[PDB]
Amino acid sequence: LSKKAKASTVDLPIESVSLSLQDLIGYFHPPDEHLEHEDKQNRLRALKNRQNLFQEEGMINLVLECIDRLHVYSSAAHFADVAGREAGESWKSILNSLYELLAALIRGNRKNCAQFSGSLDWLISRLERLEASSGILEVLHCVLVESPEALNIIKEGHIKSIISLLDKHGRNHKVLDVLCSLCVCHGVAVRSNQHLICDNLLPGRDLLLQTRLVNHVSSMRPNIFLGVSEGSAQYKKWYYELMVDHTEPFVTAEATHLRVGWASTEGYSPYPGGGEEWGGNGVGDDLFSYGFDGLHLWSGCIARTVSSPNQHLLRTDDVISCCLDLSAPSISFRINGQPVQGMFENFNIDGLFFPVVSFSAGIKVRFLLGGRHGEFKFLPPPGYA
Amino acid sequence: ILELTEQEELLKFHYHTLRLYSAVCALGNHRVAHALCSHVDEPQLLYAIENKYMPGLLRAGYYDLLIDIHLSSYATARLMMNNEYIVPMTEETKSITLFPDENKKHGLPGIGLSTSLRPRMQFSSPSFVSISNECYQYSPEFPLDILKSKTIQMLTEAVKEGSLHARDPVGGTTEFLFVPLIKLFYTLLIMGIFHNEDLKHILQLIEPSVFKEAPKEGLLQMKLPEPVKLQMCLLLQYLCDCQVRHRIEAIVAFS
Amino acid sequence: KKSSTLQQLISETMVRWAQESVIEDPELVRAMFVLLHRQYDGIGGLVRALPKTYTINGVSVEDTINLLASLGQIRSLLSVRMGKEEEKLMIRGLGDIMNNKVFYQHPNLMRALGMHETVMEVMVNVLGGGESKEITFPKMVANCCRFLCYFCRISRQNQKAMFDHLSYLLENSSVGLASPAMRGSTPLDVAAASVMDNNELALALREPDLEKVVRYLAGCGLQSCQMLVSKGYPDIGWNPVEGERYLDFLRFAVFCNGESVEENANVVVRLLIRRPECFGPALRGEGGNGLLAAMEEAIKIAEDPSRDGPSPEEDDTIHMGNAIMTFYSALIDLLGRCAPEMHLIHAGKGEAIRIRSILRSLIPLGDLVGVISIAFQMPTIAKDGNVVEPDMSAGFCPDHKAAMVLFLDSVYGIEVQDFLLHLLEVGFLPDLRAAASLDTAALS
Amino acid sequence: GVEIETISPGDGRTFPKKGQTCVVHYTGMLQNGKKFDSSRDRNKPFKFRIGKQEVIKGFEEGAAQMSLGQRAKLTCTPDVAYGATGHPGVIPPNATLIFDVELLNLE
Amino acid sequence: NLFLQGYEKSWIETEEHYFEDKLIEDLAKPGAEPPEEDEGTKRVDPLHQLILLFSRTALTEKCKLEEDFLYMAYADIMAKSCHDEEVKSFEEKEMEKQKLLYQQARLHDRGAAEMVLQTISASKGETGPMVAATLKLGIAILNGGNSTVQQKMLDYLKEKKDVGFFQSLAGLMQSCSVLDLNAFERQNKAEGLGMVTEEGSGEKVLQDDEFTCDLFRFLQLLCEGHNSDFQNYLRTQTGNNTTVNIIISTVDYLLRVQESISDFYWYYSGKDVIDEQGQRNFSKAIQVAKQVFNTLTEYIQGPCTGNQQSLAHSRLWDAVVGFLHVFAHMQ
C-alpha cells in the first residue's frame, strides 16, 4: 500500500489480525487476584515463560514494526483513503490492540523491559499522537517500573516531552505516575530526574493545581437600597462614613482584609449581585462592587493604586467618607477629610446600590449613616444626602 | 479544597500531584525539598494536618508530604544508626543503672539518661530572598514543638473518638483517620523529639495500664484495621529497640 | 491481669490479634511474629547488639562524631543512583574518613560498623553498571580500592574480613590494570592487600583462585592490549602491562613474610607449566628466542622512539620496552620465589627436586648470566655541568637484574668457585665499579 | 531598579546604616500575584546584614530605602532579581518580584 | 571492649532458657471462639497462620531461596517443641511416645510437612541454613517413624508432582561435603607454625557433617517402618515427568565418603599415633558413613526388590570393598 499497489490486488488480513491480537492479549492476560496462591503462582510462571519465549523469538520487534508501519498514516480517514474504508474503521482499534499487546508482552518481565531500553527513545517520539498516547504511556510506565537500565536512558528531552504531554493533553494522573517512576525506581532515587522534573514542572505554576491559605472574608451592609430610574421618587446622591476603631494588620500570616465602599444588586433582587456567598472575596472583587482600601480602588477583582495625602493602608482612627452620585454615575472617597483623586464612574445603574464593608478577622469598625445612626465627622458634600 | 470530596477528578489529580511532590523530594533531595517549601508552605501543611473535613486521600498525601519534606532525612539517618551502640565512657555513662531504684521495676521505655552517640539533627531556613547555597544541606525547618503538641492532641482526640466507632471518621475511614496520624507520630518518635512528659502521655495513650507511672483504653485495645496494626507493630518494635539500647548502655556502665 | 511489662503486653497483643482474626497481610503477619519472637528471645537481642557495641573515651568523642557523620553520608548515598555529584560526595566522604584519626586508632570499630561492606557495595554497583562496556566512574573504583587497601593495612582482622571478598575481586581483577597511576587502586590490588604478609590467608588461598589468575595471565600472554592498540601502541602479540600485574599478585600469593609458601608455590608452578603461554614470547618454548634475547630486544625497543611510543608519570606514554622488561623480571622473580627450599632439597623431597628441575629446564643459567652482564645507562655531566639523567622508567633498571639474581640464587645457587668468579667478573663487578664511579657529589 | 511604595509609614528618621542587621517580615509574590515566599508563614523574622551580598540586591537597597517600623511594597525587576536564569524550581526566568516588607528592627 | 566481646561470647550466648513448647502451645490455642460465637468455618489459629505464611513464601516463585531469620527461628522453635529431650518403665516410655505423637500432631495438623517439603523444593539443591533448619524440622516431626506424617508427605508429593523436590534432594546430596586431606594438611602446617585458631575447631575439614547426617536421617525417616510407598517412590516417581534415583544418589555419596575415609587411613597408616584432630575427623566421617548405611538399610528392608536390584547394579560393591580394606587394616 505504501508502494501504491492497487488496493484490490494486495490483501490486508484485517479481521485475522484483530482476532489474533485479541487472542494474544487473552493469552498474555495476567492472573486474577481472587485465585488461590498456588494457582496464581502457576499462572504467573506460565505467563513469564510465554513472555520469555516471545522475546527470544523476537516478537516485540515485530509488534514494533507493525506499529511503526501503521503510524505512517495520521488518521483512520487517511488509512481508509489509502487502504479501504473497512481498514479505516479497524485502524485505530488495531493500533490500540498492538500497544496493549506490547504492554502485556513486557509487563512485569525485567529482561524484556531491559531489552526494550534501546527502543524506548523511539516509543516516546509519538507521545503527542492522540491515537497512541495512552498505549505509549502504559508501555513507558511498565518499562520504567521494571527496568532500571531503561530508566538510565531517559533524558531531559524525554522528560520535557512528557511534561509537554501534560501541557497539551490536560490533567492526566498517569503522566504524574510516570514522573514518579522516573523519580524513584526500586528504592533508588535519581537525582538528575528529580531535579529535571522539579525545575521543568513546578516554577511555571500553570498546570498543577495551586494551593494557598486564604482568610475568610465577610461583608456587612445596611438594609438600605439605593437606585435610579426614570420617573422615580428616589434621590440620586448619597453619603456615609466608616470609622476604623481598631484593625490588626496581621492576625494570621496573610494581611488583614478591610475594604469599604458600595455594591450593586442584580436587577431589583435584594441579594448582592455576581459574588460568592462565602470565601475570601470582598468589596471590589467583582464588577458589582466598588471598594477602597486606603491605597487602592478595587473593582472587578482588580486594584488600582490611587493617590491621597499621606496615603496609607486603612488603620486605626481612619474615617472614610463614601459618596455615591447616580445622576452621572460616580463613586468618590475622602480619607480623613482629604479627597482621594480616584473615581469609579460609568458603571451599570440598573440595580440597587447599598453601602458595604468587607473584612477578614481583626477589625473594629463603625458605620456612621447620619442622623440618629451615627454622627458624621465631616460635612457631607453639597447635594449629597 | 474541601469540595474535592465531591470533585473526583480534581481529587485524584491533586493526590497524584502530592505523590509527585513526595517522589521529587524523596531520599534526601534537600534542594527539591526547599523548592517544594514554596509551593506547599508550613501554614498549608499544618492546616491540612489538622482539618477534620479534609478528603482522606489529600489528608494522607499531605501527611506524607510533611514527613518527606521536613522529617524523612533525619528519621532515616537515625534509623540507619539505630542498630549500632557507640557509648562514650563519661561520668554520665557511668551513672546509668539497669533499674531506676531498688524495686526492680522497668522504667518507662525511652525515658532516662541515654549517652550513646546519635546523629546530629540540623535544619536549614527556607528563604528564597537569600542567595547563599549552604541551606541546601540539611532539610528545611519546621516547628517541632508545635508539631509535637498538635500530634499529641489529635492522637488523644482520635483515641477518644474512634473508641466510640463513630460513623464519621476524619478522612472518611478509620484507616484515613489513623494511618497518617500514627505515621507522623512514629516519625517524630523515631527522631526522638518527644521528651519526658510528652512521652509519658504518649505511653499512656498507647496503653494506660501498663505504662501507668509508679476506664482509659489505649490504642492496642481498639479493634484496629490491618495497616494500623502494622504501624503499631513498628511502634512496639521501636520501644523494644529503646529497651535494648538502655540495656547496652547499662552494661557498658557496669563494665 | 495487668501486663506490668512491655514484653508481656506485646506477647499478649500479638497472640490476641492473631487468634481474633485471620490476617490477610503477609507483611503484618511477619511483623507480628517477629515482634513475638523478639519478646521471647530477649537474649538474642543482646547477642546481636554486643558485637555492634563499642566504647570510646571522652577525648575521641568529636572525632567519632565526625566519622559517624561521614559514614552516614556514605551509607545514604547507597540509596541514590551514581552520578558525578554522588561521585564527588563519596570521594570527599572517603577522604574525610581516611583523614580521621579514629579510623586508624579503632579498626575494630570500623569493622563493626561494616564500612568495608558499604564501600564494596558501592564498588559492586559501579562495576556492575557497565561491567561489559567501559567502566563508568573509574575514579570511584580507584578511590574505593585505595580505601580498601588502607583498611586491609590497618589490621590483620580487617585483612581477614576483606579476604572473604577475594572471589569477586579476582573476577574483577582486569578493571584498571592497563592504566598507570591506577596502581594501588584496582580490585586486584585490593585482593593482593587481602593476602599480603599473612600466612593464614596465604594458606587459605585455594586452587580455583590461582587458576583464575593463571587464566588471566595466559590471556595477557596470548592477546594484545586492545586499549593500548586503540591508543596507537604497536600491536605486539601479548600484554606485558597486565601480565606483570597478575605476576605480582601471584608473587604475593606464593611468598609471605620472607619465606615461600610451598603449597601455593607448587600449585602456581603446576598451573604455569600447564599453560606455557603464561611465560611470554621468549619462553613460549616453540620458536621463541631466549630470555637474554628478549631483554636485548626490549632494550632496542626502549631506545627506538617509534616502537616505544603510541606514535599518533607514564600517563598515556607507557614505555613498551620497559613494560616487556618488567613483565619478564616479574615472571623470573615469581619463579625464583616459587623455587623450593635448600633444606627440602637436602632432605631429598621428590616434589622439591622435581620443581627445581622444572625451573632449571624453564630458565637456562646462561640467560641469567647474560642478563646480569647487560650494562646500565649512566648519568653523565654535560658540558654545562647540569646532570643529564636518563629516565629509568623508560629503560633497563637494576630491579630486573635483582630478580635475575634472586632466581639464580634460589634455583641454581652458587656452589663452585669457578662459577662464582665468572659471575663476579662478568655481571657483578662492572655494576659495583659503576656505582663507585657515581660517587661524585652531584651524581650520587 | 527597585520601586518603593509606602503601605504603613515608619518614623521617617532611622534608616539602615552600613554594618547593621535589618530584621524584617516580608511576603514574596510573583508579578501575577502568586505567593512564593513569606517569613510570616515560618513565623521567623528574616535578618540580613546590609552591604555583604546576603540577599538579592533589589530586596537589599529597597529595604535600605526604608525607615524603621515602615511597611512597603518593593517591586524588583529581573535584573536586580534572579534574572534570566531565575531560581530553579520556584522563580521562572525573567520574573518581576513584589515584596511586602516591614522593617521590624535594626541591630 | 575486650570484656564486652568476651562477656557476649561466654555468658549471653551460653544463657539457655526453654520456651519453645510453651510458645507453641500458646500459638496453637484458639482465642475466645464461642464468645465471638461466629460458629462458621473455624478460623486458622496463630500457629496455622504462621505455617501458612512460611508455606506461601516457599511456594512463591523465586530464582533463589531467600535467607529468612524469621523462618529459621520459628523452624528451630517448632523442631525443639517436638522432641522435648536411666532406664524407664514401659508406662513411662509409652507416655513419652504418646507425648511425642501429640507434639508432632500439633505441627503436622497445620501443614508443617507440606511446608518443609515446599522449602526443600524451593532450595533448588543449594545447601544453607534455611535447608538445615527445614531438615531439622522434618526430622523433628518424623521422629519415631510417624506414619501420618509419612502419608501426608507422600500424598502432597504425588498430588503436586513435585520434580523440584527430588531434584533439590539430589543437588543437596551432591553438595554434601567429605573429608579433605588438603585442608587437614594446611591446618596442620598452620598449627605447626603456631598461629592461634580463630575458629574453635578449624571445622573446614568435613564442612557440614551435621547437615549431611540430618539429610540422610530425614531420608531414612521417610522410609522408616518398611514404608513401601516411599522406598519405591524415592527410586522412581511414577507420575512425574522426570525421575531422580535417590537410592543411586545415596550410594554415590557413600562411595565418596568411603574414598575420603580411605584417604585419611592412607595418610595415617605410616604414623605411629593419630592426632586428636585426625581422630575427631575420623569420628565425624564414621558417623556420616554410619548414617548413610542406616539410610540404605532402611531403603531396602521390608524387602523392596526394586531398591535391592538398583543397589546391586549400583557402585555399592566398590564402596564395600574399600570399607573392608579399611576395616581389616585399622582393626
Tab-separated table of N, CA and C in Angstrom, chain A residues 43-112:
chain	number	residue	atom	x	y	z
A	43	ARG	N	-0.032	-19.617	37.226
A	43	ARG	CA	-0.380	-18.733	36.118
A	43	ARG	C	0.736	-17.732	35.841
A	44	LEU	N	1.329	-17.170	36.898
A	44	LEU	CA	2.427	-16.226	36.716
A	44	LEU	C	3.626	-16.895	36.056
A	45	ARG	N	3.937	-18.127	36.466
A	45	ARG	CA	5.038	-18.861	35.851
A	45	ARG	C	4.779	-19.101	34.370
A	46	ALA	N	3.553	-19.506	34.025
A	46	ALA	CA	3.218	-19.725	32.621
A	46	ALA	C	3.322	-18.432	31.819
A	47	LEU	N	2.837	-17.324	32.383
A	47	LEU	CA	2.915	-16.039	31.694
A	47	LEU	C	4.362	-15.617	31.473
A	48	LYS	N	5.215	-15.809	32.482
A	48	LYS	CA	6.624	-15.461	32.330
A	48	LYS	C	7.295	-16.327	31.270
A	49	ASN	N	6.960	-17.621	31.227
A	49	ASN	CA	7.517	-18.487	30.191
A	49	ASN	C	7.079	-18.039	28.801
A	50	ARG	N	5.801	-17.679	28.651
A	50	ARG	CA	5.315	-17.187	27.364
A	50	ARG	C	6.039	-15.912	26.953
A	51	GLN	N	6.210	-14.979	27.894
A	51	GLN	CA	6.915	-13.739	27.592
A	51	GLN	C	8.356	-14.011	27.183
A	52	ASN	N	9.033	-14.917	27.894
A	52	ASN	CA	10.417	-15.234	27.562
A	52	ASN	C	10.526	-15.847	26.173
A	53	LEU	N	9.624	-16.774	25.836
A	53	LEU	CA	9.673	-17.392	24.514
A	53	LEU	C	9.403	-16.371	23.414
A	54	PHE	N	8.416	-15.495	23.621
A	54	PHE	CA	8.130	-14.461	22.631
A	54	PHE	C	9.322	-13.527	22.452
A	55	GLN	N	9.967	-13.136	23.554
A	55	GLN	CA	11.143	-12.277	23.460
A	55	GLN	C	12.284	-12.974	22.728
A	56	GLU	N	12.506	-14.257	23.018
A	56	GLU	CA	13.588	-14.983	22.362
A	56	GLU	C	13.334	-15.145	20.872
A	57	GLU	N	12.077	-15.315	20.472
A	57	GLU	CA	11.740	-15.340	19.054
A	57	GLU	C	11.585	-13.944	18.462
A	58	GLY	N	11.724	-12.898	19.273
A	58	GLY	CA	11.748	-11.538	18.769
A	58	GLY	C	10.405	-11.017	18.305
A	59	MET	N	9.354	-11.313	19.070
A	59	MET	CA	8.017	-10.856	18.710
A	59	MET	C	7.817	-9.378	19.021
A	60	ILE	N	8.551	-8.852	20.006
A	60	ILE	CA	8.440	-7.438	20.355
A	60	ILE	C	8.858	-6.563	19.181
A	61	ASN	N	9.945	-6.932	18.502
A	61	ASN	CA	10.383	-6.164	17.340
A	61	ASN	C	9.351	-6.218	16.220
A	62	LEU	N	8.699	-7.368	16.042
A	62	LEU	CA	7.653	-7.478	15.027
A	62	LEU	C	6.457	-6.592	15.362
A	63	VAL	N	6.054	-6.564	16.634
A	63	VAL	CA	4.963	-5.685	17.050
A	63	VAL	C	5.350	-4.225	16.843
A	64	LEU	N	6.599	-3.878	17.167
A	64	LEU	CA	7.079	-2.519	16.942
A	64	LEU	C	7.056	-2.165	15.462
A	65	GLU	N	7.441	-3.111	14.602
A	65	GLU	CA	7.408	-2.871	13.164
A	65	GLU	C	5.985	-2.644	12.675
A	66	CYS	N	5.038	-3.450	13.162
A	66	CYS	CA	3.640	-3.254	12.787
A	66	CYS	C	3.138	-1.886	13.235
A	67	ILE	N	3.475	-1.486	14.463
A	67	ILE	CA	3.067	-0.177	14.969
A	67	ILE	C	3.679	0.937	14.127
A	68	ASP	N	4.966	0.809	13.796
A	68	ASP	CA	5.645	1.827	13.003
A	68	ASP	C	5.022	1.963	11.620
A	69	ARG	N	4.699	0.838	10.979
A	69	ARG	CA	4.098	0.906	9.654
A	69	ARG	C	2.647	1.368	9.694
A	70	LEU	N	1.942	1.157	10.807
A	70	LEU	CA	0.608	1.732	10.937
A	70	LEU	C	0.655	3.225	11.241
A	71	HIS	N	1.744	3.704	11.842
A	71	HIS	CA	1.840	5.112	12.212
A	71	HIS	C	2.176	6.034	11.046
A	72	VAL	N	2.463	5.499	9.857
A	72	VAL	CA	2.703	6.360	8.704
A	72	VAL	C	1.439	7.063	8.236
A	73	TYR	N	0.276	6.648	8.730
A	73	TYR	CA	-0.993	7.292	8.420
A	73	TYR	C	-1.452	8.087	9.635
A	74	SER	N	-1.822	9.349	9.411
A	74	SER	CA	-2.155	10.237	10.517
A	74	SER	C	-3.542	9.987	11.096
A	75	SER	N	-4.439	9.339	10.356
A	75	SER	CA	-5.800	9.181	10.843
A	75	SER	C	-6.473	8.002	10.157
A	76	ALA	N	-7.593	7.579	10.752
A	76	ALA	CA	-8.384	6.495	10.183
A	76	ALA	C	-8.905	6.862	8.802
A	77	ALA	N	-9.250	8.135	8.594
A	77	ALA	CA	-9.677	8.573	7.269
A	77	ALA	C	-8.552	8.424	6.252
A	78	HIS	N	-7.327	8.789	6.637
A	78	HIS	CA	-6.185	8.625	5.744
A	78	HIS	C	-5.963	7.152	5.415
A	79	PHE	N	-6.017	6.289	6.435
A	79	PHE	CA	-5.864	4.859	6.189
A	79	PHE	C	-6.988	4.316	5.318
A	80	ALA	N	-8.190	4.885	5.431
A	80	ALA	CA	-9.302	4.464	4.589
A	80	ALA	C	-9.110	4.883	3.140
A	81	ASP	N	-8.596	6.092	2.909
A	81	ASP	CA	-8.293	6.512	1.544
A	81	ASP	C	-7.220	5.625	0.927
A	82	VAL	N	-6.186	5.287	1.701
A	82	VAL	CA	-5.077	4.517	1.139
A	82	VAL	C	-5.461	3.051	0.943
A	83	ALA	N	-6.165	2.459	1.910
A	83	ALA	CA	-6.266	1.006	2.002
A	83	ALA	C	-7.694	0.471	2.023
A	84	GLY	N	-8.703	1.332	1.994
A	84	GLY	CA	-10.078	0.884	2.056
A	84	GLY	C	-10.768	1.305	3.347
A	85	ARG	N	-12.089	1.475	3.251
A	85	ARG	CA	-12.842	2.116	4.328
A	85	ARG	C	-13.057	1.170	5.511
A	86	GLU	N	-13.116	-0.140	5.257
A	86	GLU	CA	-13.118	-1.099	6.362
A	86	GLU	C	-11.793	-1.065	7.126
A	87	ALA	N	-10.674	-0.989	6.401
A	87	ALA	CA	-9.377	-0.852	7.054
A	87	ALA	C	-9.303	0.453	7.832
A	88	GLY	N	-9.905	1.514	7.293
A	88	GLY	CA	-10.002	2.755	8.040
A	88	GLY	C	-10.763	2.589	9.341
A	89	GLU	N	-11.856	1.818	9.315
A	89	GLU	CA	-12.573	1.540	10.559
A	89	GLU	C	-11.689	0.804	11.558
A	90	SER	N	-10.925	-0.180	11.089
A	90	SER	CA	-10.180	-1.043	12.003
A	90	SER	C	-8.817	-0.490	12.410
A	91	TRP	N	-8.374	0.613	11.802
A	91	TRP	CA	-7.030	1.139	12.042
A	91	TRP	C	-6.776	1.475	13.510
A	92	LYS	N	-7.651	2.286	14.112
A	92	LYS	CA	-7.423	2.732	15.484
A	92	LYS	C	-7.510	1.575	16.472
A	93	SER	N	-8.478	0.680	16.273
A	93	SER	CA	-8.604	-0.481	17.147
A	93	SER	C	-7.374	-1.372	17.052
A	94	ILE	N	-6.835	-1.554	15.843
A	94	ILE	CA	-5.655	-2.396	15.688
A	94	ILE	C	-4.442	-1.746	16.344
A	95	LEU	N	-4.307	-0.421	16.223
A	95	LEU	CA	-3.206	0.262	16.902
A	95	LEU	C	-3.307	0.111	18.416
A	96	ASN	N	-4.511	0.295	18.965
A	96	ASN	CA	-4.700	0.137	20.405
A	96	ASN	C	-4.384	-1.287	20.843
A	97	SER	N	-4.836	-2.276	20.067
A	97	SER	CA	-4.562	-3.668	20.402
A	97	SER	C	-3.071	-3.972	20.334
A	98	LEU	N	-2.367	-3.394	19.358
A	98	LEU	CA	-0.928	-3.612	19.251
A	98	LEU	C	-0.190	-3.035	20.452
A	99	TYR	N	-0.558	-1.822	20.868
A	99	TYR	CA	0.083	-1.237	22.044
A	99	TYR	C	-0.231	-2.042	23.300
A	100	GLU	N	-1.475	-2.506	23.432
A	100	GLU	CA	-1.839	-3.345	24.570
A	100	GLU	C	-1.053	-4.651	24.566
A	101	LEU	N	-0.863	-5.246	23.385
A	101	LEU	CA	-0.080	-6.472	23.282
A	101	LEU	C	1.374	-6.235	23.662
A	102	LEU	N	1.951	-5.112	23.232
A	102	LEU	CA	3.318	-4.785	23.633
A	102	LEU	C	3.424	-4.653	25.147
A	103	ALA	N	2.474	-3.935	25.753
A	103	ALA	CA	2.492	-3.750	27.199
A	103	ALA	C	2.349	-5.078	27.930
A	104	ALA	N	1.479	-5.963	27.436
A	104	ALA	CA	1.323	-7.272	28.063
A	104	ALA	C	2.557	-8.143	27.864
A	105	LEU	N	3.223	-8.017	26.715
A	105	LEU	CA	4.440	-8.779	26.461
A	105	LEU	C	5.547	-8.386	27.425
A	106	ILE	N	5.686	-7.089	27.704
A	106	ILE	CA	6.817	-6.622	28.503
A	106	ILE	C	6.478	-6.416	29.975
A	107	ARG	N	5.207	-6.498	30.359
A	107	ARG	CA	4.812	-6.141	31.716
A	107	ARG	C	5.344	-7.153	32.724
A	108	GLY	N	5.994	-6.648	33.771
A	108	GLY	CA	6.481	-7.490	34.843
A	108	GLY	C	7.679	-8.344	34.506
A	109	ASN	N	8.247	-8.197	33.311
A	109	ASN	CA	9.369	-9.015	32.860
A	109	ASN	C	10.607	-8.128	32.787
A	110	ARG	N	11.542	-8.348	33.716
A	110	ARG	CA	12.724	-7.495	33.802
A	110	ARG	C	13.578	-7.593	32.546
A	111	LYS	N	13.776	-8.806	32.027
A	111	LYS	CA	14.615	-8.974	30.845
A	111	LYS	C	14.004	-8.280	29.633
A	112	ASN	N	12.695	-8.444	29.431
A	112	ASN	CA	12.038	-7.805	28.294
A	112	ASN	C	12.061	-6.286	28.423
